[PDB]
């Protein structure tokens, strides 16, 4: 019986795999590389950056270049998954509020270019909620360039209450680079930025009380950690460990006028029918690579508890596998015995065209 594929098109990292698997088989940079002075995709393009000019066709979860996106999909099928796409139903993910035109284009490419026998598009945040075993909750999805707050009720996102913070992982990596300079350290090249990324992913944490945490770092060397660069050198990180992710809660750190993620979540909740707000507060699901900082759930709990009436039960759900929550959610959905009905078939595409996506995929 047919094997479906699942592709989660992240702005920075693409995750691809087979429905039924508990993890994506392939995770690689969403980059297309072309001769600086054919093409490459993923790790290889990143490696050969010395002779290639790199492009990221996905910005804030939205596709900005369709020729490059096609290259990425072609590569995903033939190289990463080693399948013939015309032999597999394909489930693709999209950002919340993906423009109508983009949904039709993704649909058109799959059927016309790749000749997929069937296809489906699901909202990333909804797949994450499903993966957590819930039909109601508010998802805080933070990856590469944006953090989305998506309220969902009984299986469906509430578009009117979906909000977003234009700040995510790449911005935090950028920030760590900058604050590490004030200490003396200089990381400006690509391989150097990868080191800063590694530092963020391995030593950073969200402090429960920032002001108290800074006082602690200032009056003691207790919060300091040592990092060994690949070039033998061992550097020392201090309050940068928590100042970096603090930007999610205090976007002013990056000179942004926007409200931190805790307020965005609260604001999204306040835009929904008062009758369902209790269920959102009690089911705040975090997903995405940028929610992986230790301490983020405790901090989200504290901030949300502070904004909501003291009667409100606040529950933050932060599964250890939250970096792949969207993909896992798609793997489950695509594996259901009822999925064969939900997808858009070639037959349907042939008869109705791209616009069929607005009637078959919410």
């Amino acid at each position: 019986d047919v094997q479906a594929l699942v592709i989660d098109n992240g702005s920075g990292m693409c995750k691809a795999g087979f429905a039924g698997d508990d993890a994506p088989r392939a995770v690689f940079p969403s980059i297309v590389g072309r001769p600086r002075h054919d093409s490459y995709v993923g790790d290889e393009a990143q490696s050969k950056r010395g002779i290639l000019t790199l492009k990221y066709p996905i910005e804030h979860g939205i596709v900005t270049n369709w020729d490059d996106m096609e290259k990425i999909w072609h590569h995903t099928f033939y190289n990463e998954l080693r399948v013939a796409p015309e032999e597999h139903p394909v489930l693709l993910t999209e950002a919340p509020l993906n423009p109508k035109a983009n949904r039709e284009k993704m649909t058109q490419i799959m059927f016309e270019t790749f000749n997929t026998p069937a296809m489906y598009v699901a909202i990333q945040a909804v797949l994450s909620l499903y993966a957590s075993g819930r039909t109601t909750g508010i998802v805080m999805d933070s990856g590469d360039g944006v953090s989305h707050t998506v309220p969902i009720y009984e299986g469906y996102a509430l578009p009117h209450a979906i909000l977003r913070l234009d700040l995510a992982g790449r911005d935090l990596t950028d920030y760590m680079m900058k604050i590490l300079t004030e200490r003396g350290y200089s990381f400006t090249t690509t391989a150097e930025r990868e080191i800063v990324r590694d530092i963020k992913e391995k030593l950073a944490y969200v402090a429960l009380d920032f002001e108290q945490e800074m006082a602690t770092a200032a009056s003691s060397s207790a919060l300091e950690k040592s990092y060994e660069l690949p070039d033998g050198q061992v550097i020392t990180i201090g309050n940068e460990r928590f100042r970096c992710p603090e930007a999610l809660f205090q976007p002013s750190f990056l000179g942004m006028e926007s409200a931190g993620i805790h307020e965005t979540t609260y604001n999204s909740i306040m835009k929904c029918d008062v009758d369902i707000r209790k269920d959102l507060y009690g089911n705040v699901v975090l997903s995405g690579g940028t929610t992986m900082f230790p301490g983020i759930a405790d901090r989200m709990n504290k901030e949300l508890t502070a904004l909501a009436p003291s009667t409100m039960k606040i529950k933050i759900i932060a599964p250890p596998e939250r970096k792949y929550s969207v993909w896992i959610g798609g793997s489950i959905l695509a594996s259901l015995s009822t999925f064969q009905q939900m997808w858009i078939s070639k037959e349907e595409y042939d008869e109705s065209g791209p616009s069929i996506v607005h009637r078959k995929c919410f």
Partner: protein, 123 residues
């Protein structure tokens, strides 16, 4: 998305229980209603008859303490699907082992029981 079991769902007042088994919705033998494997996930539809002739629905997806992600994820999705199939008339309820609602617990006359075990993950 009409599944064979969906065709049977909510036809008359009463209780219907299905267990998630390898990405599919499988009916539980009526003689086993109330005996929940803690390593599994289930979907329970409670149909109540209304004066007008139509029925009232409450969909509860029960999650055992040891059920795998695919099972709890599927129970939630099947619950959204059943509701959609029933024209969106069902109130959905997440029921976690050891924390079920008074309503849900009340569907079992002699009280529900927990038993270790269940069907293997579908992953």
């Amino acid at each position: 998305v009409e599944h064979p079991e969906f065709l049977k769902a909510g036809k008359e007042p009463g209780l219907q229980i299905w267990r998630v088994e390898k990405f599919d919705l499988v009916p539980v033998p009526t003689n086993l209603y109330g005996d929940f494997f803690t390593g599994d996930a289930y979907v329970i539809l409670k149909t109540v008859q209304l004066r007008n002739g139509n029925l009232q629905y409450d969909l509860h997806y029960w999650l055992g303490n040891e059920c795998s992600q695919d099972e709890s994820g599927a129970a939630a999705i099947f619950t959204v699907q059943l509701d959609d199939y029933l024209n969106g008339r069902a109130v959905q309820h997440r029921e976690v082992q050891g924390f079920e609602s008074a309503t849900f617990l009340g569907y079992f006359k002699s009280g529900l029981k927990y038993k270790k075990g269940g069907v293997a993950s579908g992953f």
